[PDB]
């Protein structure tokens, strides 16, 4: 199939999580959840993320609990029956822009915004696509390429031609540990934060593996060696044979 | 019990084999014996050799298969470039 | 500041390789420009672009970029 | 090797020295790996990431 | 007599994996079945419990299953397990069916026994595809919709076969709740065959790499075979765990992480790998009923091994030509996955049908062919009249 319809291959950037060893940058998590906040969630929704699961990964309990309550949610009716409207609760998933994907398409010239709760393990490249496309964009598409009223041009995007403009631009966001925000660091933040909201169980999980394997290892090399053992009397067994006379 | 059908292997007393005779068998405990480790000096140029003249079997078919479709994978890389889309016209329908 | 992928691919366009790559690249996109002047560029069927060249460039800077970009970021 | 015949004397270890080794490598173990862990992860952890932080 | 002998229930534990003689030679070929035993059980049992937090109706299941990700405790390692040891029962089961080609195992007096593990191996194949479903994802829907519809391709009756397996006019609801019931059923019928499939294996016992008679020297099941079956199992086990824990979605597919979605099939879509090579068996036949009929041909060709080999020894050990042959056929088999894996453009077509014939070919030419060439040549390398 055509280069152009297959996409450009995402290259392998050194994340700080690659390795097995490896946790995530808990820092870097922070960062990227401003990103999303201050740019991404205009568009994009974080359905499978409560609130809760940021609480000890990149915030404190309070500020949390902060920022939960900037949203209203639906209560259980009054006393009445009318309905009424909650501050939002660590129990509660963080709020999507639209209110159904009728009213996302119609404010994306008929696109729909996908949701990014998964975003990181829907799609083959994981990180380097995701920073890849981010980081992408051309200022001018390739000569010849006949581009489509209101799409944008994009290498690392199958087909090249993708619905989402650029949205990432030099010091667009202030980040709040001082850390200079270009376009690279903000997309390598987001990332990581989006990793993360794919992989809530990342660190945890590669510490059990290391045990798992350890033990594991150790069961392998030793169950061997009794192996061996048991059968030693017949690995070296020895035979002979005297005809029998008639 | 039920009359079992006749097959080819009984159990042990009468196993099914033939009437054996002339035949001795020594063994030794597996206690008396050299703790793991002489494994190697006498069993590691010994080894080995059971692959050796297997590996042609396993190997020549895999070459065959290998080059068969590296083959095929780069000529498709050529039809979809530049260059073979005159070509592809050709083959395609 | 200015972007640290920005400044690690202008870098890398520069480099003998790299400009060898953006020749081939301009050279295809002089030879795009030239065919849409002319008559009967709408009805042709056969219009030719420069993604391959566009490609091989993008791949290039891919390539000596992405071991590095992350040493520069925090 | 003799450091075997002073705990257990030429017999095998049973059951009941075997389960109660258990629970203690448990715990022996899980602190090891864990301090390993978050050594070698230092600097990337929350815990890390909110001692630089004062609100 | 002993205990272990004389209990009604104990003597079956007694004559299977205690006292039960082996021939003294089998290799760590034979390891495989005890590992296919395991890989049921790990399946079992994860299923279980995650049952215990899965929703089957339609708008739940993909959530009901992230919610097993995001808030069972374990939840991850419970899926993970599951969806890997599935990928895991499929690489063992290839190897398992392999040794029996190799090995001659088909063969009389084990025809029934081989007869059995085929039955077994559709019925695993149908229990995977009833899970891949229950997840509910892009390759889900796709999977199912495809799959259902293989029975389109009966003439007279195959759409109403279809709808009715659908329980209405495409993959809905009633579609989603009964695949989940039948995959909760399924796994069990397999054990029922599992126990039939022993059964049969007791009568004349294992074969061994030397392809003669075992019954002049045996030793037990009991020490001997169980540690040395340990071996693989932890093997098996650390294998299994460096990609739970460290490549859990290697082995998958990106798309099955998106719902599905009734109105758009991804231009990504591609089957589970170990379905690849009867994919593109499928997909080689330019015909509807064909096609389908050559792909199921592929599985029940298996049957007809014990009657097209012909040679007079069981087993490729001292078989020169037969070794190469099964070689090929080995390759042949990854190629025709390879293929699967591919678009359908010019090379891959054209590679693919030959693969396809070369499959065929293999247990109704080259085999009956080969093994009577093999007798022959036996025979008058030693006859000097
Ligand atoms: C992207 C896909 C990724 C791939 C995924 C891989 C698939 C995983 C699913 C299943 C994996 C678990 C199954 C294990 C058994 C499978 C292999 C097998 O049965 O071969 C038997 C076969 C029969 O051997 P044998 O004649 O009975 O043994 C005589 C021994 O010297 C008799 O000697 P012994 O009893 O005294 O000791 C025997 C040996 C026994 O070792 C074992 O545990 C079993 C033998 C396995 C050897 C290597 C298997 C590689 C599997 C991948 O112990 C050893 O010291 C050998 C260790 C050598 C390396 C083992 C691998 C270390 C991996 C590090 C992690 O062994 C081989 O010839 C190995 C062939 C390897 C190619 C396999 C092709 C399929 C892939
Ligand atoms: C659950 C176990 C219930 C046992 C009943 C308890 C009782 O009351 O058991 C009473 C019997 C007495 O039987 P007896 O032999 O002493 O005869 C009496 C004098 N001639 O003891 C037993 O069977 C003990 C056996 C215990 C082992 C049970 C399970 C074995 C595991 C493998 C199962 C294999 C069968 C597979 C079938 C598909
Ligand atoms: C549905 C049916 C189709 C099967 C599916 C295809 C099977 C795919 C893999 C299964 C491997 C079976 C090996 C042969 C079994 C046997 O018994 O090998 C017996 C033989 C030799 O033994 P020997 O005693 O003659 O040695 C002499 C002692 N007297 O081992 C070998 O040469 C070693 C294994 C060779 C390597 C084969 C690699 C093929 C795997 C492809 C990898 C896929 C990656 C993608
Ligand atoms: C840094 C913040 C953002 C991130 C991390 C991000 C990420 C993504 C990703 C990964 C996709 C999926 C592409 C694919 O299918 O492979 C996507 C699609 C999309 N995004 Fe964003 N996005 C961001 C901001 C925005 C904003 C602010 C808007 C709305 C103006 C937007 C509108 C869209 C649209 C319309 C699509 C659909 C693309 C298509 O179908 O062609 N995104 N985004
Ligand atoms: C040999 C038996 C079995 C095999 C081969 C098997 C295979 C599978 C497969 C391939 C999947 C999809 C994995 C994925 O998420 O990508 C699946 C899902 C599932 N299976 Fe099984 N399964 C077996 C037995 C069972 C049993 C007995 C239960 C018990 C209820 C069960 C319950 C489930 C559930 C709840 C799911 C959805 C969760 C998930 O996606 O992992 N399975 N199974
Ligand atoms: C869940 C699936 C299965 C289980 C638990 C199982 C288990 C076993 C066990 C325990 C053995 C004895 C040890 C060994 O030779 O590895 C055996 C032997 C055998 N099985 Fe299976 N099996 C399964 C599937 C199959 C399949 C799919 C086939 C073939 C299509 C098959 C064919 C055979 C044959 C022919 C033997 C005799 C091998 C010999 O002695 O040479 N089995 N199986
Ligand atoms: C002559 O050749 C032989 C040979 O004969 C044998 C026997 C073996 C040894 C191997 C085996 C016997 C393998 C056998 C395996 C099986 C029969 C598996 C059957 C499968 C099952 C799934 C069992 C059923 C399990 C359950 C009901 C339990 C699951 C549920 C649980 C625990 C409940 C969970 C719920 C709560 C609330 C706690 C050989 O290796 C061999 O060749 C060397
Ligand atoms: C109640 C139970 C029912 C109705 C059905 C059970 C029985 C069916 C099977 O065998 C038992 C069946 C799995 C078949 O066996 C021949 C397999 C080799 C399937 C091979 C298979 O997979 C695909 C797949 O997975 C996909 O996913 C995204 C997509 C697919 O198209 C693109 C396919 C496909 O085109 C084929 C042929
Ligand atoms: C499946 C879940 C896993 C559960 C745990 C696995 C099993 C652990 C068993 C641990 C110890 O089990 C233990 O085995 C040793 C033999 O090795 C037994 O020893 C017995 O045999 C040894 C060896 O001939 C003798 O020296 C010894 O005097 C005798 O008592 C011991 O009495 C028993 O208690």
Redesign the pocket.
Known sequence: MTAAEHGLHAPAYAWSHNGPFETFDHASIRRGYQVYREVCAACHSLDRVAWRTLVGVSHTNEEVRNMAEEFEYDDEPDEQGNPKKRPGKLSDYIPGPYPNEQAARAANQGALPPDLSLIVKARHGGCDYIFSLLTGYPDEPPAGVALPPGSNYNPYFPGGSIAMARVLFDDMVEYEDGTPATTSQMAKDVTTFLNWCAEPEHDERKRLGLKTVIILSSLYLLSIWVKKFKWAGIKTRKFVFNPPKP | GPPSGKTYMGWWGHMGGPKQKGITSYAVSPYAQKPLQGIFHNAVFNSFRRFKSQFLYVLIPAGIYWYWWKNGNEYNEFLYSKAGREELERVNV | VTDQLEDLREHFKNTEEGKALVHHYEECAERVKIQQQQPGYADLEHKEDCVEEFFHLQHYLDTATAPRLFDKLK | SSLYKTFFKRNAVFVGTIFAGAFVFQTVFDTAITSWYENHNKGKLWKDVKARIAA | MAFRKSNVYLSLVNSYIIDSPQPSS?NY??????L??L??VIQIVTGIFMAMHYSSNIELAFSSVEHIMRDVHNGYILRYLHANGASF?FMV?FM??A??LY????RSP?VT??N???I??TL?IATAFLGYCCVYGQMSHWGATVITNLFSAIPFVGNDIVSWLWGGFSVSNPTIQRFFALHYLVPFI?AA??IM??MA?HIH????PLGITGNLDRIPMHSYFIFKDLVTVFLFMLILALFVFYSPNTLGHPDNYIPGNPLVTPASIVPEWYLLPFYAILRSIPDKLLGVITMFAAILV?LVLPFTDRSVVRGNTFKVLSKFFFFIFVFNFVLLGQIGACHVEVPYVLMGQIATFIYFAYFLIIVPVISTIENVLFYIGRVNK
């Open positions: 089998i070929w034979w390891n495989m079945g005890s296919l035993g890989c049921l029962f089961m398992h069916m040794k029996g090995y001659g195992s088909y084990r026994l081989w059995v593990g085929v077994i191996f695993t397999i065959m599992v499939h022993l294996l016992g294992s074969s061994n298996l």
